[PDB]
C-alpha cells in the first residue's frame, strides 16, 4: 500500500476501491451526496452543507439525496469530485499524487466525459499516472473469453454489452434504468403491503440484506406463486440485528421477478431477457451465434440464485430452436469489474501502459482514446 496502484470502480450506486493485487476491493461505499432538506432552524450545531456515501445514507431522513451518475453516466461533476476525494482521503486513506490510478468506465461513455475524468484526476487529484478500462470488457475477460454479451446489472443501471475480441459494439448496447436499489425499494414496498414496517435508513439496510440473502429468481414464476399460496415450503426465516426472527414467503422471488417483468414497479420497459435478445439482434448476423453461446453476467444484481437458469430459459424461448445458448455466471461476478482491474494493474507488464502526467501534458486530452484496453 506504499506506492501500490489504485483500482477505482465508480459504480452507478457503489464505489469499489482498493489496491492492485488484492483479491477484493478494500472500500465499498454508496456513490451518493446528501444535502440538508431545509436551510436551517439552528446555526452550526455540527451541521455540514453536504454529506457523502454512508454519512449521507445514515442521515437520509433529514437530507435530499443525489447520485452523481444518471442513466449510467457521470453527470454531476462537482458531486463526483466529492466522491473521488472521499475515496482517496477518507476510505483508502492515501495521497493520490503517490499512486497510479486505474478507473473503470460505464458503457456508451462520451469521449468528452472520459477526457473530463482524466482532467480531474491529473489536475485536481494530481495522480502520477492513469488508466481507463471499460467495466464490461474487464468482466468478460475475467470470465475467460474475449467475445460475448455481458449482462451488467448493478445498483442504478443494467446494460447488455455485446463485445467482439475485447471491443464493445456501441450501436448494439442496451440500457435499462432498473437495477439493485430499485429491487431493494420494491422489496420494502411488498414487505410493507404484507404488514411489516421498514422505513428508517437502518431498516432500508435490513431490507437490502434480506434481498441479498433470501431472494431468488423462480424458473416458472406462476408455478412458484401457486406453491407459495398452498404451501409454506418457500418460507425463509430472517434474523433482525436485535435478534427478532421474521418469516418471508413469495417476496423472495417476486422482488427479482421485476428484472424480467418491469411492470411490477409500473416501469414501461422490456425485461432483461428481451433487452439481451434485442442487443444480440442489433449486431451483424454472423457474430450472433457467438453472443448466444456467451451470455456473461456481472454485477451485484446478477447474484440471485436461479437468475442464470431463468436467463437460459428466456433466451432459448426467443432465439432460433437450433441455437446453442449458454449463460456464464462467474462466482466472482459481484466484483468481477474491480477484480479484473486489480489483476491488470498488478502486472509488471502493465507499468508501461499507464498514461503518465508527462504524457498527458505533451499529447493533450486525445491520449485517453489512443491508450486503450
Amino acid at each position: 500500500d506504499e506506492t501500490t496502484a489504485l483500482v477505482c470502480d465508480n459504480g452507478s450506486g457503489l464505489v469499489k476501491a482498493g489496491f492492485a493485487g488484492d483479491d477484493a476491493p478494500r472500500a465499498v461505499f454508496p456513490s451518493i451526496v446528501g444535502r440538508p432538506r431545509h436551510q436551517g432552524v439552528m446555526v452550526g450545531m455540527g451541521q455540514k452543507d453536504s454529506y457523502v456515501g454512508d454519512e449521507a445514507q445514515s442521515k437520509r431522513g433529514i437530507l435530499t439525496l443525489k447520485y452523481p451518475i444518471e442513466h449510467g453516466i457521470i453527470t454531476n461533476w462537482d458531486d463526483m469530485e466529492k466522491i473521488w476525494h472521499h475515496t482517496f482521503y477518507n476510505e483508502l486513506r492515501v495521497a493520490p499524487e503517490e499512486h497510479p490510478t486505474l478507473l473503470t468506465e460505464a458503457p456508451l461513455n462520451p469521449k468528452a466525459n472520459r477526457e473530463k475524468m482524466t482532467q480531474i484526476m491529473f489536475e485536481t487529484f494530481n495522480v502520477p499516472a492513469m488508466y481507463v478500462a471499460i467495466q464490461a470488457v474487464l468482466s468478460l475477460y475475467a470470465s475467460g473469453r474475449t467475445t460475448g454479451i455481458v449482462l451488467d446489472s448493478g445498483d442504478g443501471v443494467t446494460h447488455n454489452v455485446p463485445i467482439y475480441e475485447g471491443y464493445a459494439l456501441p450501436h448494439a448496447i442496451m440500457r435499462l434504468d432498473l437495477a439493485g436499489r430499485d429491487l431493494t425499494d420494491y422489496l420494502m414496498k411488498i414487505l410493507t403491503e404484507r404488514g411489516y414496517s421498514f422505513v428508517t435508513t437502518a431498516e432500508r439496510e435490513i431490507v437490502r440484506d434480506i434481498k441479498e440473502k433470501l431472494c431468488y429468481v423462480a424458473l416458472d414464476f406462476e408455478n412458484e406463486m401457486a406453491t407459495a399460496a398452498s404451501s409454506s415450503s418457500l418460507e425463509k426465516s430472517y434474523e433482525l440485528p436485535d435478534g427478532q426472527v421474521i418469516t418471508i414467503g413469495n417476496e423472495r422471488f417476486r422482488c427479482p421477478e421485476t428484472l424480467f417483468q418491469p411492470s411490477f414497479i409500473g416501469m414501461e420497459s422490456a425485461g432483461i431477457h428481451e433487452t439481451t435478445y434485442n442487443s444480440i439482434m442489433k449486431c451483424d448476423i454472423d457474430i450472433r451465434k457467438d453472443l448466444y453461446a456467451n451470455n456473461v453476467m456481472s454485477g451485484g444484481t446478477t447474484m440471485y440464485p436461479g437468475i442464470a437458469d431463468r436467463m437460459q430459459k428466456e433466451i432459448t424461448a426467443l432465439a432460433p430452436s437450433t441455437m446453442k445458448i449458454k449463460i456464464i455466471a462467474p462466482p466472482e461476478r459481484k466484483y468481477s469489474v474491480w477484480i479484473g482491474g486489480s489483476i491488470l494493474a498488478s502486472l509488471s507488464t502493465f507499468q508501461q501502459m499507464w498514461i503518465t502526467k508527462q504524457e498527458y501534458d505533451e499529447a493533450g486530452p486525445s491520449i485517453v482514446h489512443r491508450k486503450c484496453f
Partner: protein, 171 residues
C-alpha cells in the same frame, strides 16, 4: 432545581452513566469518545439550569448561550473524523452522526422529532456494530443498547417538559 433540571440529572445518572460504564469496558477510542459525549451532556445540563431561571434571550446573548454545546458537538465529530483508521470506526460513526441531537435546545419547534432522526442516524451504525460483535463480546451489544437509551430517554424527557421547544422561564 425545577422538575426538568432534576429530570435531566436523572438522565445523566442513569442511561448516560451506563453508556460511560460500557465505553470504559471497550476502552480505547470508544472510551475517549464517551468522555467528549459526557462533556456535551454536562454542557446541556448547564444550559437547562440557565433556561430554568431566565427568560428566552435573543441574538448575541442566545448565541453565547448555545455556543459551548455547538462547539462540543464539533469536538465529538472531529474526533471520529481524525480517527478513520480506528479499530472501532462504526462505534465512533454511530456517535459522530448522532451527537447533533444535543442541538435540540436551539430549535424553535419540534425538538422531539429531531432527536428521533438523530437516533435513526446512530442506528445505521449501531446495527453494523451488532452484526459484527453479536458473536464476539456481549459488551458491544450492551454498549449499543446503552448509547441508544440516551436518545430514547432524551425524547421522553423532551415530550414531558419541552414538547414545543426548550421551556425557558416566564418570570
Amino acid at each position: 432545581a425545577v422538575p426538568y433540571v432534576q429530570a435531566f440529572d436523572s438522565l445523566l445518572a442513569n442511561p448516560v452513566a451506563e453508556y460511560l460504564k460500557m465505553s470504559k469496558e471497550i476502552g480505547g477510542d470508544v472510551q475517549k469518545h464517551a468522555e467528549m459525549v459526557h462533556t456535551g451532556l454536562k454542557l446541556e445540563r448547564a444550559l437547562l439550569a440557565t433556561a430554568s431561571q431566565s427568560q428566552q434571550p435573543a441574538g448575541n446573548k442566545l448565541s453565547d448561550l448555545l455556543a459551548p454545546i455547538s462547539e462540543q458537538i464539533q469536538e465529538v465529530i472531529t474526533f471520529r473524523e481524525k480517527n478513520r483508521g480506528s479499530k472501532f470506526f462504526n462505534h465512533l460513526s454511530a456517535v459522530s452522526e448522532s451527537i447533533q441531537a444535543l442541538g435540540w435546545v436551539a430549535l424553535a419547534a419540534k425538538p422531539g422529532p429531531f432527536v428521533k432522526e438523530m437516533n435513526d442516524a446512530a442506528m445505521f451504525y449501531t446495527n453494523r456494530v451488532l452484526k459484527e460483535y453479536r458473536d464476539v463480546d456481549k459488551k458491544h451489544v450492551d454498549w449499543v443498547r446503552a448509547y441508544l437509551s440516551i436518545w430514547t430517554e432524551l425524547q421522553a424527557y423532551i415530550k414531558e417538559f419541552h414538547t414545543t421547544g426548550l421551556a425557558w422561564s416566564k418570570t
